[PDB]
Amino acid sequence: GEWEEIDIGPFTQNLGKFAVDEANKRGQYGRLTFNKVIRPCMKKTIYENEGFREIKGYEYQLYVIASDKLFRADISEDYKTRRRKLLRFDGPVPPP
C-alpha cells in the first residue's frame, strides 16, 4: 500500500471539493470556498488483508486551495461503496 501520485483532474478536484464541503460542516476552519486541488495529489490503496489484493479502500492526500488558503486534506474512500470520509483537514500548510 504505497502512495501513488495521481492527477489533479476533475476526479481529484471533486475530492478537494468533498474535503472543503466536509471542512465547512465541521466548522473548525471557518467558511471556506473551494478553489482548486493543486499537485501533488497522492493516493494509497488499503487492502482488506495483508498479503491479499482485495482492496478495502483508498486514502488520498490532497492540497486544496479554499478561500485563498492552502489546506492538506486526507480523505478515505471505501472501495465497495465509494463512501468518502474527511480524515484530516489541516492548514494553512506550506506549499508542497
CB 4 within 8 A of CB 42: yes
Q: What is the spatial distance between Cα 39 and Cα 51, in angstroms, rounded to a whole number? A: 31
Quick one: which H or E segment has residue 74?
strand 69-78
What the chain holds in terms of domains, given with CATH numbers, is 3-90 (3.10.450.10)
Strand order in the sheet with 3-6: 3-6, 34-47, 55-66, 69-78, 84-90
Neighbouring CB atoms inside 10 A of 94's CB total 8
Q: What is the spatial distance between Cα 57 and Cα 24, in angstroms, rounded to a whole number? A: 24
Using DSSP, state whether 22 is helix, strand or coil.
helix
CB 72 within 8 A of CB 94: no
Angle at 38 between CA 95 and CA 4, to 5 degrees: 100
Report phi then psi at 95, rounded to 5.
Answer: -55, 140
Q: What is the spatial distance between Cα 13 and Cα 38, in angstroms, rounded to a whole number? A: 8
Closest CA to 75 of 7, 31, 1, 14: 14
Q: What determination technique applies here?
A: X-ray
CB 71 within 8 A of CB 90: yes
CB 2 within 8 A of CB 68: no
Q: What is the spatial distance between Cα 68 and Cα 33, in angstroms, rounded to a whole number? A: 8
